[PDB]
Amino acid sequence: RNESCSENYTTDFIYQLYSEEGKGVFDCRKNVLGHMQQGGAPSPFDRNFGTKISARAMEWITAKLKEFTTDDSICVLGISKRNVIFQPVAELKKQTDFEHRIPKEQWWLKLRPLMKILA
Amino acid sequence: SAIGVLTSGGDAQGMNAAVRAVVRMGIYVGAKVYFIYEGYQGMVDGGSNIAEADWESVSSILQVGGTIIGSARCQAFRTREGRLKAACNLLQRGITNLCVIGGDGSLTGANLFRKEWSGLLEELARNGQIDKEAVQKYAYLNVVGMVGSIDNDDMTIGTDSALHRIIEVVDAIMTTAQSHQRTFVLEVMGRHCGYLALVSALACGADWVFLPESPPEEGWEEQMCVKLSENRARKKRLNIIIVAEGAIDTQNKPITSEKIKELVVTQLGYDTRVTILGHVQRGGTPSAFDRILASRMGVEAVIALLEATPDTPACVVSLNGNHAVRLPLMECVQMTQDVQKAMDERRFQDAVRLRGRSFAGNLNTYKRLAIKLPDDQIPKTNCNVAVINVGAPAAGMNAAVRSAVRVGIADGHRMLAIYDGFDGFAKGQIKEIGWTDVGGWTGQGGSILGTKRVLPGKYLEEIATQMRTHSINALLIIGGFEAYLGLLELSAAREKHEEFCVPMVMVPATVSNNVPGSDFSIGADTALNTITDTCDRIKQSASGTKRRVFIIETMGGYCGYLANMGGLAAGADAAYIFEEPFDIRDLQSNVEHLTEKMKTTIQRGLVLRNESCSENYTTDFIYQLYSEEGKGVFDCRKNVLGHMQQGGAPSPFDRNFGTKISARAMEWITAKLKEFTTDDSICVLGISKRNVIFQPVAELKKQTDFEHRIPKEQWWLKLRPLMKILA
Amino acid sequence: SAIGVLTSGGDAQGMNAAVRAVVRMGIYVGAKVYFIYEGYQGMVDGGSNIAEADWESVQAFRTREGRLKAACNLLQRGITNLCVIGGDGSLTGANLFRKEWSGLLEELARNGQIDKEAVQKYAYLNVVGMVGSIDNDFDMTIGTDSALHRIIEVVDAIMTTAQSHQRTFVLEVMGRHCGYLALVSALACGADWVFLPESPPEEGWEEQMCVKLSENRARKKRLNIIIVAEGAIDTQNKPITSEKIKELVVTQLGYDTRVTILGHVQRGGTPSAFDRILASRMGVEAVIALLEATPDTPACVVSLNGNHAVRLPLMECVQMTQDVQKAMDERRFQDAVRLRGRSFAGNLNTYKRLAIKLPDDQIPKTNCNVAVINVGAPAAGMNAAVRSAVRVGIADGHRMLAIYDGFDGFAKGQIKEIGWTDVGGWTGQGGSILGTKRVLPGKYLEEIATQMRTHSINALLIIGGFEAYLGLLELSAAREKHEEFCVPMVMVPATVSNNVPGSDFSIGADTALNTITDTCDRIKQSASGTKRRVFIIETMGGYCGYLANMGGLAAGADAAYIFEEPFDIRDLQSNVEHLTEKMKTTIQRGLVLRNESCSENYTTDFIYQLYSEEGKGVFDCRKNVLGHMQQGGAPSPFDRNFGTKISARAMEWITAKLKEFTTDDSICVLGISKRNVIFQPVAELKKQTDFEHRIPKEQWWLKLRPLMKILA
């Protein structure tokens, strides 16, 4: 359960519902993982990820300084599809759900049917 | 096919609950229900005075006193012309079923209307309506009566409420009569029945009462004045004299309140004041008792109406003490006339008989608690009887202690008070208590002796020693489930400790009503009335906000009594209890139902939840479900009443309950002492069916859910379908 | 040095609170306080009739011989300050006693006292009086509100039975010389007629009254209530009995009439929240007056003048009684009613303009449409307010419009023209018949404007809480874009919380206070014998500490935690320890009130746990969250009258504005400040508002905070 997926249907709520309706068949246990999810040592992927984009970003900074500013001077360097691209924050505003602080369009949602399939 | 409902004669609080129950139960079984306004006069007048009732009509009337469809003394109904008119107006609407809620003769009018139904042939002779109407509606006039007056001609609608009003007045007066040593003469409503007066006097520990059934004997004036002078000797700052309006001599002369005042002033020179309560007795909000009674009665009235046949006589739907019954009408009218006949020829004693066992009992208890004999006249047993309070406090415990102590003293016992339950018992907190010590206790809430939850198990030695050092020959416990457990434990401890081989009896006192062997417990009624009041207020709030459902958490532990009865009297939409399992579908069902309800004009919801009804489906849970599924239709609020729902000072019912039941317990103790171990020496005195019975605790074990501290079978569960039907 | 307190003539509820306040405030200022039992007679008798008061305690005087006795007994105890709480004539004895204090010299002439008491003991007899009667010929007095509660309780009960037939009830209430109680009762129950000792009925009143009743039956009002003061009189100072009124109605109209003489219940019952608080404040002010007294300062009577403690010189009060009586004998009844004060005349005029309607033809119809609405959470007295507003509006020749379900229904066009009969019987109804919502008008500005255009709303009156104020602000802002809002707008404060800026009181708050006190009384009754308990009770009010504070005060709470006064764990600990010591005494109970929003971390649960744990060997706790029941059932009499009057005033303002496109003074809040009801432009109130916590920046009742600890 995502922590903020529902205001009323909390972790406790879901636990109670499953517990009660499952009584003669199964019992439940509830766990809230917490800040341990920030991890200990970074995964190899995260190490390389940080390393790489930071290197490229700094390249961009150096290119910009080698030339007072506009809108393309303030960017987010992100991964889109197969490339890492620079996006002015102004373009990203319309691409943002500021109320819930999530992107309006998220690729991985397309993988949702897989859960049920892989049971 | 169609039911007509009306209210006739003196207006009772809870008449609206009755009308509501009749309408809703009627619609429920698929019948057409019609209001008949202005009692019988509406029936005669016709037109606008007979209007069809829909579900919404009877909403927001339950908590209101009087009768929303009104009442008027019809004269035209006493004439054949008017009964013809009424018959006509009824036939026009196809009404052939009648539910009459009201006083004494208001029913006789319906009974006579029943016997005299052949006015239709007359109107056929007088072609006022065509034939084939004749044969279709003729011998098919169904009649059911509901006693809805305070005259009480069993329990009638409004009596508890009126009693509430009276005792409210008395309690209010007690706060002002510290200003000098004043005597208050209160005239309450009784022209022929002295029930209201008797019960008022018993509920307030009145110094004197005057009844039409039992006139005072010569020379009562001297005795009454000596009693009052004794009270000032006892330095009691107050005096209360309850007077039925129809108070009479042995010579059928009325005894006015002014006459009483004149007597007190002339003989004792006391500051005496008269108050004629009057119609306030009829007003105010119906108590939980009257609401529930009226509801059950209205429903039973509809059922009776359906099950009736042409051979079936007109009946009065009644409560013969906590189960629904149908009494033949003519028999009742004949009883009233029997009593009347007895009063006129001065057969006052059989009149008191004719009133019933309840009456004579209330009266005997009042007498033996109000009048004390001098010690020289008390044979005196050399026995020591102990009184104790065990468990949580319950409103009416002090009344119980007062009763027990005074009855014990009258029976020649030396009474001993044990303070702070078994905690104080083990600690030797024992003091011989007297007649005066318990004075004025009746209306006191909480526990003056003190009560604790602690069981005797760990201190069997310490208590035994005490029982031996004080020579306790018998024990009466006033308390809840813990009292019962205590009795069980002492019963077990008997063999090792001879001190426990004495007769022991308990009377159930708890807001929860979870003591096995009793249909009712002292303190519960007060809690119900507080709960109902709070729900009235909440219901009002939702009514002004609109599109609101309140989830209200009640007390009771695992016992669903308060949640259920409270829900019933409050007009709750649902009441979730442990005794009745509920799953997510039931909850969703109620959600959908409330959704539908929000389309109507009554855009409010009231959901009660017994505190321990579910481990998973908590108050929060239910609130979240209702909130989420109600989105766009209604929103919720959660309220946890907390222990304050238990109330403050005991309700009149709880006062009298404690008084009477404790008096009886003491009677049992004296009888037992008038002779060693076995099992019936340790009992629970409880209410079962129409009777009060003594039950050995050992027998009650098999009837107990010790895991949840509730009786295995609880009568009121049979009333569960009513909630849904009336909401 | 030593204070003597006694009661003479008193029959009012709240006297004990007064006596308590005197004792404790007295001990607090370092004085010795003594009870004097049996009034002045106790002072004369001496001995046991005068007993020293400690924290837990909580014919002859007309002969010179007896005053000598009394003087002696006081001197024995060093008692030199007298506080007399009681009736009319009860103070004059103390005043003359003061002036006659040279009885001390007489006692030196005899051997009753040495000389060093004369000089140590003359010229300081300081006397202070407190009105503790309900029929006060000699402002608001202790017991008035409580009596009003009693009467209105009776009336409310009778009203449900007066449907059994169309009964007309003639109710005899307490007024032998003062007609305040009768008038105010009538205003509180929407009585069909009232009879007062100061203002006799005018010419052909019998016919007028019968016409009124017949009109009520025409409009199908199922009942009639006539309030009669005990000393009801005609223009010839002969009495107008209730019996006579009944005879009149029976003879002329043939209605089912009943007489009810309320009597001593009026004097009984529990003191109201108002009376408890008033009495406490009075006792405190009395002790203060006693200390601040000089030999030159005359004996005074402590009073409350517009939510302020005042000291009135006694002789002025008796001179008032004598002036009024003189006017009564000389039949200058208007001069008498005049002498009663502005409040009286106001109550009377409002009652009249609400009880008696002129036929439409005699009402110059202004072609204006005035809208009435309820905004925010429900408050007891909203319906009374709507009734008043509507009827005054109609009387002023307006077409009244009712808007249902606040701005929600407003936006939905839930608008229906309302009439005189429609609001009948509303006075004693709790909640909101129109319906009320917290939703603000901001997001439905177009939708509302359209409605104001389709219905031609020329003015708007809002009965509501903080949300109403916010709404007014929003509409004020919306004016330029929507011309429909360029109409006069006024609000009257209605909320249990009393958090509306520009008002010292709001409709519904009093009912709530009485709910808190009632609940605390019942809690006290229940488990009365249990001992070593502290109750933690959570009240409403939002961030506003009014309910928690005043409720605590009237309840005799040991603490009241509010947002307006920050508290940390040390403060909590201090109170816990204080209660621990308190459990050593004879009063082994604790009562802790908590404003729901007083702290983010220090919740009701938190406080309960701290008290429970630190109190383990000494006491245990119980927790209660009162909930929406604090909105009340039937509105208290005070809230009923408050709604009625304030709304009437508001409507007067509206008609005045229409008798004259708008600015800032066209959108106001009508609130109570000190002693006056004033109209304040919302823009001006902005500077006085904490919009973050929805409470006023400055709240009067905060000066009463030290009282809590003092009164323990």
UniProtKB/Swiss-Prot annotation, chain C:
It is found in: Cytoplasm. GO terms for cellular component: 6-phosphofructokinase complex; cytoplasm; cytosol; extracellular exosome; membrane; nucleus. Signal peptide: none annotated. Substrate binds at residues 133-135, 167, 174-176, 230, 258, 264-267. CDD domains: Eukaryotic_PFK. GO terms for molecular function: 6-phosphofructokinase activity; ATP binding; cadherin binding; fructose-6-phosphate binding; identical protein binding; metal ion binding; protein-containing complex binding. InterPro entries: 6-Pfructokinase_euk (IPR009161), ATP_PFK (IPR022953), PFK_vert-type (IPR041914), Phosphofructokinase_CS (IPR015912), Phosphofructokinase_dom (IPR000023), PKF_sf (IPR035966). The keyword Transcription does not apply. In human PFK exists as a system of 3 types of subunits, PFKM (muscle), PFKL (liver) and PFKP (platelet) isoenzymes. Belongs to the phosphofructokinase type A (PFKA) family. ATP-dependent PFK group I subfamily. Eukaryotic two domain clade 'E' sub-subfamily. This is ATP-dependent 6-phosphofructokinase, platelet type. The gene is PFKP.
